[PDB]
Write a structure and sequence with these properties.
The structure is cut from a larger assembly and holds chains A (78 residues) and B (68 residues).
Chain A (H helix, E strand, L loop, with lengths): L22 H55 L1
Chain B lengths: L2 H65 L1
Classes of the chains: A mainly alpha (78), B mainly alpha (68).
Organism (chain B): Rattus norvegicus (Rat)
Family (chain B): Belongs to the syntaxin family.
Protein name (chain B): Syntaxin-1A
Chain lengths: 78, 68
Amino acid sequence: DMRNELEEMQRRADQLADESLESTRRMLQLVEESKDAGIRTLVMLDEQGEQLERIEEGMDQINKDMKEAEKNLTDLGK
Amino acid sequence: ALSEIETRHSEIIKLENSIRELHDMFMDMAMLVESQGEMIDRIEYNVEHAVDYVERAVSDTKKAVKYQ
């Protein structure tokens, strides 16, 4: 009558982490810095676009003025 | 669990949101910068026209006035 039976106990392997808290924090800090740099680039790019738009009008005005002056001088000369 | 799962989930979610924000920022950057590029391309042709016109005009007028 040496017929034995058993029961079982369970253990849980550690969840997936303990490497997600050293590279993670550095990743977040770098992401924040990149976000700030992107915001600054946004602002600078908008300012540059405004300045180019401003330049356009003066360019067109000088072109028109020179063309009209040349035509007038030619007309009077002949 | 405890700090383990909460850290995993929170950091992952925050990183995903930040990355999506960066993606949108870069898209807008590209669009506006393309607009600036075509604007400068527009400037170039009129700059060339003006320089050629002024050179020809000054040369011709100087020659005409000197000869007379």
